[PDB]
């Protein structure tokens, strides 16, 4: 369905998204510390499907800044 569901709760397209292997919803790669395609692992699960250590406040900060300057 092309649904973005990310830890920033700012679910519009930022230009670089990655799809959860399980729920098939998409996340912003940068919110998960994935800066380019090379940093994306073979297997990938979102934080909802597999809770991980991830900086949620930083994710929100980055996405909110993108929105605030567009």
């Amino acid at each position: 369905m092309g649904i973005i569901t990310c830890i920033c709760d700012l679910n519009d397209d930022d230009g670089f998204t990655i799809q959860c292997d399980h729920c098939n919803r998409w996340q912003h790669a940068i919110c998960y510390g994935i800066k380019d395609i090379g940093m994306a692992p073979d297997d990938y699960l979102c934080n909802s499907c597999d809770p991980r250590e991830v900086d949620i406040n930083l994710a929100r900060k980055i996405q909110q800044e993108r929105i605030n300057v567009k």
């Binding site: 397209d13 230009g15 990655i18 790669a29 994306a40 297997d43």
Partner: peptide, 11 residues
């Protein structure tokens, strides 16, 4: 993983 990435280029 499966990814989408949009490139924006002017000329």
């Amino acid at each position: 993983a499966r990814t989408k990435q949009t490139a924006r280029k002017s000329t």
